[PDB]
Write a protein that binds this ligand. Structure first.
Ligand code: HEM
Ligand code: HEM
Lengths: 101, 379, 51, 60, 120, 53, 79
C-alpha cells in the first residue's frame, strides 16, 4: 500500500491541479453523469467548487501558480463529487439494464 | 428602441459570432491559430483571385503564364510568393490547431471535430491540385504519382484514375480540371468553416484547463478581438519574412523547369505538408496497403474521440499523456523528414518504425496511459 | 456495445433485418442500374439487350 | 500645467473626428518620412551597387 | 432584471453621450424647470429648511438664497449643459458597483468604451 | 550574377520591401502588443474574493 | 441559447477590477515576467524536450548511416 500511495502521491504532485488550488473532482470532465452529479451537490460545495474553478481559470489566464503554501495537499483532497457521481452512474446502469430486458 | 447590433438580423448574427460571444478568459495563444487559419483562407482567396487574372490553364501557356506573373505583372511576384508561402503557413496553422485539439480535448466537440477533419481533407486536396497548376516538373510528376496511387483501389482503380486524369495520363485535361477544382474548393472550405463555427458556438470553446468556464466568460469584442489582431500581425510577420527574404525556402527548385513528361526529376517528392503521409505510404510495401494507411493517417482523428479514456478532458493535468503527445509530435517531424529523404537502407526502417509508432501512440499507448492515470488518481 | 447486448436488442435486430435486407437490395439494384454494371446486368434477361 | 500628452489629448484625441483627421495627416506625413528614410538606409547599405548609384557612368 | 442590464446600461450611456454632444434647448428648459420645482418643494417645512440652513453653512459657508439659485439656473443653456457634460461625462473612466445577478452587466472595457462615441 | 538577376529580377526590390516591412513590423508589433495589454490589464489585475455567508 | 444572462449560477463571488487608464500596461514586465517564464520552462522541459532529443539522435544517426552507405567498401575490390 505504501508503495502504491507513494506513486499516487507522485502523480498527484506531477499533475498541476493542486498547484492551482483545485481538488481532483474539480478537474473531472463534465459529461452528462457529471452534470447531474454537479446539479445534485449541496449549495456550499457547489459554490466552493465554482469559486475554486474560477480562481484556477484566473491563474491560468495570467500563467501563474498559487503560492506553494496554498497548494492542495494530497491528504486533504476530498472527493466531494464521487458519491454523487457513483449514485448517478448506478441509476444509469439500472436504467440501461432495465432497457436491455 | 433596440440596439441595432442586437436586433438587426445580419448584425445579430455578427454580434453573436464575434462581438458578444461568451469566450473563456484563459484560452492561450494556441486559440489564435483558428483565427489565423481564417485569415489565411481569406488571404489565399484574394491572392489566388488576383493570380487567376493572369493564369492560363493550357499546357502550352501554364508555365509561361506563371513566368509572366513573376516578371511582368506589376507586383506579381509579391502575389505569387504570398500564395505559395501562405499555403505553407496554412498547413502550419492547420497542424497546430489539430495538435491543440488533441492536447486539450477539443475533440470532445464531435460535430466541430468531424467538420474540421472534412476541412482538413478539402484543404489538402486544394493544395495538391494547386501545386499542379504551375506545371513544372515537380507538379507533373508528383501529380502522376499521387493520382497513380488511386489505381491500387481494387476493380475500379484504373477507371477512377483515368476518369480523374481525363485521359491515359496527366495532360492538358488534368491541368484544366485541377484549375477549376482549385478555384471552386476554397469557397466550399469557407462554407464548411461557417458550419464549423456554428457547431463550435453551439457548445462554446474549450479552455486549456479542460473545465467548463461558464463562470469566467468574457466578451469576445473587447479582449480576443485585439488578441487575434496581434496574432494576425505576428503571422503576417512570419509570412512576409518568407515572402521577402526566402521566397523559395519551402519550394523545390525543380518546379522552375517546364514539365517534361519523358524525363523525371532526380527526386520526386510532394510538398512538405504531404511528406508525413508520403512517408507512411512508402512504409507499407503493398500499394493498396499504402493507400489505406495514408487514408487512415488522417481518418484516425475521427476515432480520436472514441479512444478517449481519461476522466480529464485536457492533458494539462496528465503528465504521461503529455509525454506521449510530444512523442507523437516528434514522430510526425520524423515522418516528414523521412518522406523528404530518398528510399534507402537507413531511412526505410526508420520510416516503418515511425509509422508503426504513430498508429500505436494514437490507438493503444494513449488510452492505456489514460487508464493508468485514472487509476493513479483513484478515479 | 455494453448497453446494446440484451434480449430486447436481439429482438429489435430481428425485427429490422427484413427492412435492412430490403434496403440493401435497393442499394444493390441502384448501384448496378446507375453504373450499368455489365457483370450483373448480363444475367437479367431483358436488360441484357443493351450489350 | 498640462503636460504634452494631456495637451495632445485635449486638442486632438478627445473627439473621434479630430482623432481621425490627425491619424490621416500623420499617415500621409509618416508615409513620406518613412519612405524617404528607409530608402536612404537601403541605398546606404547597398551603396556602390544600385543602378541609380552607377547610372551616371554609363549615361550620357 | 438579469437579462436587461446590458440594454439599460447601453441606453443610460447613450443618454449621457447625447447630453454631452447634442443637447437641445427644449430639454434644457425642462431640466431647469424640474430643478426649480425640486429646489422650491424640498425647502418646505421647518425640518428641511433647517437642514438646508445647516448643511449650506457647513458646505457653502453660506445659505444660498433661492433667488441666487434661480439666477444660476436661468444662466444655464444648452451650450452650458453640453460643456459641463462633456467635461464630466465624456471619455471619463466610470466607477461601477453591481449586486445580484449581474452576469449580463458589461465588462469594464465595454462600459468605458460606451463613455465615448466614435461618431463624435 | 547575371543569371541570378535573370532568375529573380525583383531581387533588389524584394530586399527593399523586406527592409521596409522589417521596420514597420518592429514599430507595429510592440504597439499592437501595448494595445492588447491596455485592454487586458483589467482582467490581469482583477482580484476575485469569495465571501460566503 | 448561450448568452451572458443565463450561462451559469454563481453566488457570493466578488471581483474587483481597475480601469485600464488607471493601471500600467506592462507592470513589472521583466522583474516578474522573466522568473515566471523560467518557471514555466522548468515545468514543461522534462516532458517536452526528451522526444525531440531522441528525434535529433535518430536524425544524426540516419544521416551518418546514409553517408556511410554511399561510401566505397574496400573489400569489394580486394581481388
Ligand atoms: C486554402 C487555399 C489555397 C491553397 C492552400 C492553395 C495552394 C496552392 C499552392 C501550394 C500553389 C503552388 C504555388 C507555387 O507552386 O508557386 C498554388 C498555386 C496557385 N493557386 Fe492556389 N491555393 C489556394 C487557393 C487558391 C485560390 C482561391 C485560387 C484562385 C481563385 C488559387 C489559384 C492559384 C493559382 C493561379 C496558382 C498558380 C500560382 C503559381 O503558378 O505559382 N489558389 N495554390
Ligand atoms: C482551414 C481550416 C480551418 C479553419 C478555417 C478553422 C476554423 C476554426 C476557428 C475560427 C476556430 C475557433 C478559434 C479557435 O478555437 O482557435 C476553430 C476551432 C476548432 N477547430 Fe478549426 N479550423 C480549421 C481546421 C480544423 C481542423 C483540421 C480541425 C480538426 C481536425 C479543426 C477542429 C477544430 C476544433 C475541435 C476546434 C475547437 C477548439 C476549441 O474549442 O478550443 N479545425 N476552428
Amino acid at each position: 500500500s505504501k508503495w502504491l500511495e507513494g506513486i499516487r502521491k507522485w502523480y498527484y504532485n506531477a499533475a498541476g491541479f493542486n498547484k492551482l488550488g483545485l481538488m481532483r473532482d474539480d478537474t473531472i470532465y463534465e459529461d452528462d453523469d457529471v452534470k447531474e452529479a454537479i446539479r445534485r451537490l449541496p449549495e456550499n460545495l457547489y459554490n466552493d467548487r465554482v469559486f475554486r474553478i474560477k480562481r484556477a481559470l484566473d491563474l491560468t489566464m495570467r500563467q501563474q501558480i498559487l503560492p506553494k503554501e496554498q497548494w492542495t495537499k494530497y491528504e486533504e483532497d476530498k472527493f466531494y463529487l464521487e458519491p454523487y457521481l457513483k449514485e448517478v452512474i448506478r441509476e444509469r446502469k439500472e436504467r440501461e439494464e432495465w432497457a436491455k430486458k | 428602441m433596440t440596439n441595432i447590433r442586437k436586433s438587426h438580423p445580419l448584425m445579430k448574427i455578427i454580434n453573436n459570432a464575434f462581438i458578444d460571444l461568451p469566450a473563456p478568459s484563459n484560452i492561450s495563444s494556441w486559440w489564435n491559430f483558428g483565427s489565423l487559419l481564417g485569415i489565411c483562407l481569406i488571404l489565399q482567396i484574394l491572392t489566388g483571385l488576383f493570380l487567376a487574372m493572369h493564369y492560363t490553364s493550357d499546357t502550352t501557356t501554364a508555365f509561361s503564364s506563371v513566368t509572366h506573373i513573376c516578371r511582368d505583372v506589376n507586383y506579381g511576384w509579391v502575389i505569387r510568393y504570398l500564395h505559395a508561402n501562405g499555403a505553407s503557413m496554412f498547413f502550419i496553422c492547420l497542424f497546430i490547431h489539430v495538435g491543440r485539439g488533441l492536447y486539450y480535448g477539443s475533440y470532445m466537440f464531435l460535430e466541430t471535430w468531424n467538420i474540421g477533419v472534412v476541412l482538413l481533407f478539402t484543404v489538402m486536396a486544394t493544395a495538391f491540385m494547386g501545386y499542379v497548376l504551375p506545371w513544372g516538373q515537380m507538379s507533373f510528376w508528383g501529380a502522376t504519382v499521387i493520382t497513380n496511387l488511386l489505381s491500387a483501389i481494387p476493380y475500379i482503380g484504373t477507371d477512377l484514375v483515368e476518369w480523374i486524369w481525363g485521359g491515359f495520363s496527366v495532360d492538358k485535361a488534368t491541368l484544366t480540371r485541377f484549375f477549376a477544382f482549385h478555384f471552386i474548393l476554397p469557397f466550399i472550405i469557407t462554407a464548411l468553416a461557417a458550419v464549423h463555427l456554428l457547431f463550435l458556438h453551439e457548445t462554446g470553446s474549450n479552455n486549456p484547463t479542460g473545465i467548463s468556464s461558464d463562470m469566467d466568460k468574457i466578451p469576445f469584442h473587447p479582449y480576443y478581438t485585439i488578441k487575434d489582431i496581434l496574432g494576425a500581425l505576428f503571422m503576417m510577420l512570419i509570412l512576409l519574412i518568407l515572402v521577402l527574404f526566402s521566397p523559395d525556402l519551402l519550394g523545390d527548385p525543380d518546379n522552375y523547369t517546364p514539365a517534361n513528361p519523358l524525363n523525371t526529376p532526380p527526386h520526386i517528392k510532394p510538398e512538405w505538408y504531404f511528406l508525413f503521409a508520403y512517408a507512411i505510404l512508402r512504409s507499407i510495401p503493398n500499394k493498396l496497403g499504402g493507400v489505406l494507411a495514408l487514408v487512415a493517417s488522417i481518418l484516425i482523428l475521427i476515432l480520436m474521440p472514441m479512444l478517449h479514456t481519461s476522466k480529464q478532458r485536457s492533458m494539462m493535468f496528465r503528465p504521461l499523456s503529455q509525454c506521449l503527445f510530444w512523442m507523437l509530435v516528434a514522430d510526425l517531424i520524423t515522418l516528414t523528414w523521412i518522406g523528404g529523404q530518398p528510399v534507402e537502407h537507413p531511412f526505410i526502417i526508420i520510416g516503418q518504425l515511425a509509422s508503426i509508432l504513430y498508429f500505436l501512440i494514437i490507438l493503444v499507448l494513449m488510452p492505456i496511459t489514460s487508464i493508468i492515470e485514472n487509476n493513479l488518481l483513484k478515479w | 456495445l455494453s448497453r446494446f447486448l440484451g434480449p430486447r436488442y436481439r429482438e429489435l435486430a430481428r425485427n429490422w433485418i427484413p427492412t435492412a435486407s430490403m434496403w440493401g437490395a435497393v442499394g444493390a439494384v441502384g448501384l448496378v442500374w446507375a453504373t450499368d454494371w455489365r457483370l450483373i446486368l448480363d444475367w437479367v434477361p431483358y436488360i441484357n439487350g443493351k450489350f | 500645467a498640462p503636460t504634452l500628452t494631456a495637451r495632445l489629448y485635449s486638442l486632438l484625441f478627445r473627439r473621434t473626428s479630430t482623432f481621425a483627421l490627425t491619424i490621416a495627416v500623420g499617415a500621409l506625413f509618416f508615409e513620406r518620412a518613412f519612405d524617404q528614410g528607409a530608402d536612404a538606409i537601403y541605398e546606404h547599405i547597398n551603396q556602390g551597387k544600385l543602378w541609380k548609384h552607377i547610372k551616371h557612368k554609363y549615361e550620357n | 432584471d438579469n437579462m436587461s442590464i446590458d440594454d439599460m446600461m447601453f441606453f443610460l450611456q447613450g443618454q449621457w453621450m447625447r447630453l454631452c454632444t447634442s443637447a437641445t434647448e427644449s430639454e434644457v428648459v425642462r431640466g431647469k424647470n424640474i430643478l426649480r420645482n425640486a429646489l422650491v418643494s424640498h425647502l418646505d417645512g421647518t425640518t428641511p429648511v433647517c437642514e438646508d440652513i445647516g448643511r449650506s453653512l457647513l458646505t457653502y459657508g453660506r445659505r444660498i438664497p433661492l433667488a441666487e439659485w434661480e439666477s444660476r439656473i436661468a444662466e444655464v443653456d444648452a451650450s452650458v449643459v453640453r460643456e459641463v457634460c462633456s467635461k464630466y461625462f465624456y471619455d471619463q473612466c466610470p466607477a461601477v458597483a453591481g449586486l445580484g445577478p449581474i452576469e449580463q452587466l458589461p465588462d469594464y472595457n465595454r462600459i468605458r468604451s460606451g463613455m465615448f462615441w466614435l461618431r463624435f | 550574377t547575371f543569371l541570378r538577376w535573370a532568375s529573380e529580377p525583383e531581387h533588389d526590390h524584394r530586399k527593399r520591401m523586406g527592409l521596409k516591412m522589417l521596420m514597420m513590423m518592429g514599430l507595429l508589433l510592440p504597439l499592437v502588443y501595448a494595445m492588447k495589454r491596455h485592454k487586458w490589464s483589467v482582467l490581469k489585475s482583477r482580484k476575485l474574493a469569495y465571501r460566503p455567508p | 441559447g448561450r448568452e451572458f444572462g443565463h450561462l451559469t449560477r454563481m453566488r457570493h463571488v466578488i471581483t474587483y477590477s481597475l480601469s485600464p487608464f488607471e493601471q500600467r500596461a506592462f507592470p513589472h514586465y521583466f522583474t516578474k515576467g522573466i522568473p515566471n517564464v523560467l518557471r514555466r520552462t522548468r515545468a514543461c522541459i522534462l516532458r517536452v524536450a526528451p522526444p525531440f532529443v531522441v528525434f535529433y539522435l535518430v536524425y544524426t544517426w540516419g544521416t551518418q548511416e546514409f553517408e556511410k552507405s554511399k561510401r566505397k567498401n574496400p573489400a569489394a575490390y580486394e581481388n
